[PDB]
Amino acid sequence: VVTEAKADGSVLVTAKTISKLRRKLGRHGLKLSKLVLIVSMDAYYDLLEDEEWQDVAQVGNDSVKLQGQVGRIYGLPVVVSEYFPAKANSAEFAVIVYKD
Amino acid sequence: AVNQSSSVEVSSESYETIFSQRIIRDLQKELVVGALFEELPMSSKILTMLVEPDAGKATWVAASTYGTDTTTGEEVKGALKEIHFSTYKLAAKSFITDETEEDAIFSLLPLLRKRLIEAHAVSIEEAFMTGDGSGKPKGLLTLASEDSAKVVTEAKADGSVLVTAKTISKLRRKLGRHGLKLSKLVLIVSMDAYYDLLEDEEWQDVAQVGNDSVKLQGQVGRIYGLPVVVSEYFPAKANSAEFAVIVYKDNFVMPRQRAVTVERERQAGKQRDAYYVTQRVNLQRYFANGVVSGTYAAS
């Protein structure tokens, strides 16, 4: 996609990365959810001080409070992974499929 | 006493009024570290155990070298790091003499026992939060000094301070490792930092643009889903800790070889009844991880 942010250094992750990743993914690749979103441990933390629509307050959530963020991110489940290397030019997300 | 003004009838002197023997009590700290951490009973002086290290990687074949042909790497040849739990001890005493209860009121005996246990309770509670290393164990606020847990900076050291909800998110970004899934973490905040948190204007503001209904009945102690614990044992405003967060899942256990015993001697003394009390309870962590303190440096 190159580039949203700048490796923490003045602006962090934003909820419209997932829309752009979904847009460029595989054209006809949808059919509701049924798509798996792997998120770095780092990237999970800066999307939690939001300031975006999928919040833990009331801005546009499903009433989450209880627990500390939920798998609703464009209808996708959130899968954590801590195995990611240097934070500079690396990937922090993976959008992958399992229907074929 | 009956003086000021005594006019014009009976003047007399001073002490001419009934006195009351009843006591009253002001402030107290509420005790949140001395009764929150699992007791480990043990019959010795030091307790030891082994624990594994992690990976332990296994190398893949070089896409030609499939046979024998050895070279496949190997995993971790030395392992099972030992961990030792030391125990620390303390004592107090207070000694009364007959000469200061006969000319008095005959009431000082039960109050002394209440006071020495409170003084002991204050002393252990400060030591668990703030402590050094020599003679008395190291405390929780400086637990996060040796592992590089710290951050610089949060709020602005008395020039337009605010303690806004993004602080705790940045603090957990700084801790990071290895369990984001809410394993019942314990968080303790300063007296002033707790008061400052209701000026906000962030996440749980004065309007229903931010928070859902959670206050109930009006500005109550609720942060990011979790309740918040407050304490008056933080040092006065400066470059120190105003907020401490610790993981509680395997760790922060207190070893102890007895409970509180309080006794008295006066034989073969001369006069005095002398109260003694002794203790042996301390604070340690199995693993050097899961601890952060903000700090709150300068801006």
Place this chain on the structure above:
Amino acid sequence: VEPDAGKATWVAASTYGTDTTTGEEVKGALKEIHFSTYKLAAKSFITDET
């Protein structure tokens, strides 16, 4: 009124000669308070003629 804290201390580890290591504590020194009371009064009058 009963008084404020109240601090104990920890042993030098090695010591065992009794040697209590306790510092000493402030046995039964406290502080008194007292209540003092003021008087409020009025007087007003009326004449037979009105």
Place this chain on the structure above:
Amino acid sequence: VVTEAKADGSVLVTAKTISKLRRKLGRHGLKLSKLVLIVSMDAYYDLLED
């Protein structure tokens, strides 16, 4: 505590004043989540533009 309002006029008294004001008294304070609040009769009719 100094300052919020400056002689009304163009800067009026709004409900955030009682947040910073109680930074040394009650809720929690001594141990009690209760207080009584008294306001001026004219100041009561200022607290309508917030």
